[model samples]
Target: PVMHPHGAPPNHRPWQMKDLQAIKQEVSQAAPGSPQFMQTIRLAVQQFDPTAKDLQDLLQYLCSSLVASLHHQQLDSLISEAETRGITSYNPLAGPLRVQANNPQQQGLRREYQQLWLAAFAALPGSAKDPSWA
Candidate 1:
């Protein structure tokens, strides 16, 4: 994740000549009108948003917690869900399973699960603080 000036570590201050030089170097590597340059600009915008702290940290924690929880739960259930979703197989020899979201209700449940995950992150103290990109 990109670090915003307000929350960046002292070593990464925007006023630092080294940081400015590094930015210039990176920007120079991409063609002015290319998609890579556009993506760089998009990244810069995301990195600099003052309000990004809460959202980014919440997302990071949510993903980590979800993965850990899933790992601790029934491994078969996790595998089954992955198979049913028709996601690209990590091992292609394995056939697809019946794991797709079969109905609107299932989709709604997924959305609710995501909301609950976000809520859990929101409930954690100190996660709202600005983080250094490092």
Candidate 2:
């Protein structure tokens, strides 16, 4: 343990929302569907396990990590209004997003989200201990 806040104290000026904008911009530019976006998924998957092996529980695993690790607060709000089709939309940017356990839409989204992990796992560099590599 050590002294001082992880980021400036809660509401300290200059380092408040302004500081977060840079990270937000980074996320916006990096865009999803790439290694960088997948890396966050990898980190979260590598970090936790469900209370039991089930669909709802699996989401429980993810939700807990998002809240604890990333601090997303919004459970269901507009994160995006439209894609880069130049179609415009708005999001409050007050995240991090929370996870709703019983929401059907949320569950459906989880199933869809599994695809990212599959791709991430597939795209990862090949094993280091393989005979061919040796």
Candidate 3:
């Protein structure tokens, strides 16, 4: 029998850049503290702990990581800014979470994410501080 030349190895699901980017896209699209954001966050938690094994521990670790990654001032700035923007509430999750890189939908998502990020970046008081110290 001829070999299936392009077949991937069985039982070996390797993570790809595409998977990473899609998760990032979803996280970037959702406002923090919103259900949409929490759902995507939980999706990654499940990926880390399949079969529901160590689920609570995994959530704690996730919280640890998020807390470790941010400064108190940053969180303060973000929360206040969000309130100012009237983003204290969010609607249901909408749109495809994953799409082809160059698809029109993906393009628009990326554009909005970038704009949202830019606004946040500009709002941070320390954004212009010396990079060497940060």
Candidate 4:
């Protein structure tokens, strides 16, 4: 028997108003009428099946990796904004905006996040035999 949270039965979480909002947002953001949408639909099919643990994990990893990459991209955009504003306090001689140099630890964290994701993909099932499949 599958355990449910807070004394609720399994599959008891019916679609809520927030669920519709999230679905609308996802569909709007996801490439519409494209292979990406088809792929997502296929994955959604797998997710609906309780036995598809591997598919769930794969989707989880994909979401996590994408979120991490987007976060790094946001940081880069912020750095660009700072440069555009002429905030060169990090550079003593008013050299080019050395954003990475200003925060080596944060940069290292972003790099580490990317590598950690790659490593996770390597450790995933069937990743070693055919990396392209996932």
What local lDDT score does residue 130 receive in model 3, on the 0 to 100 scale? 21
RMSD of 3: 15.1
**Model 3 ranges with Cα > 4 A deviation:** 1-15, 32-35, 48-66, 69-134
Candidate 1, residues 1-134, lDDT tens digits: the string is 22445756633223443432343455457543233422443343334422223224323432344433432243335455644675444343142211121223334333322333333323222222112211
Residue-level lDDT of model 2, residues 1-134, one tens digit each, is 01224674432233243323433344345433233433554444434311112323333332233322222111121123222223223132222222321234544334323443334332432211111211
Q: Model 3 — TM-score against the truth?
A: 0.25
Local accuracy by lDDT, each model: 0.34, 0.31, 0.35, 0.36
Q: What lDDT would candidate 2 get against the real structure?
A: 0.31
TM-score, cand. 4: 0.22
Model 2 TM-score? 0.23
**Cα lDDT for residue 40, candidate 1:** 40
TM-score of each: 0.22, 0.23, 0.25, 0.22
Residues 22-95 of candidate 3: C-alpha lDDT, one tens digit per residue: 55467457553233433554455334322222222322332344332442344345544644566424221133
**Better by lDDT, candidate 3 or 2:** 3
Backbone clash pairs in model 2 (N, Cα, C under 3 Å; residues 3+ apart or in different chains), count: 5
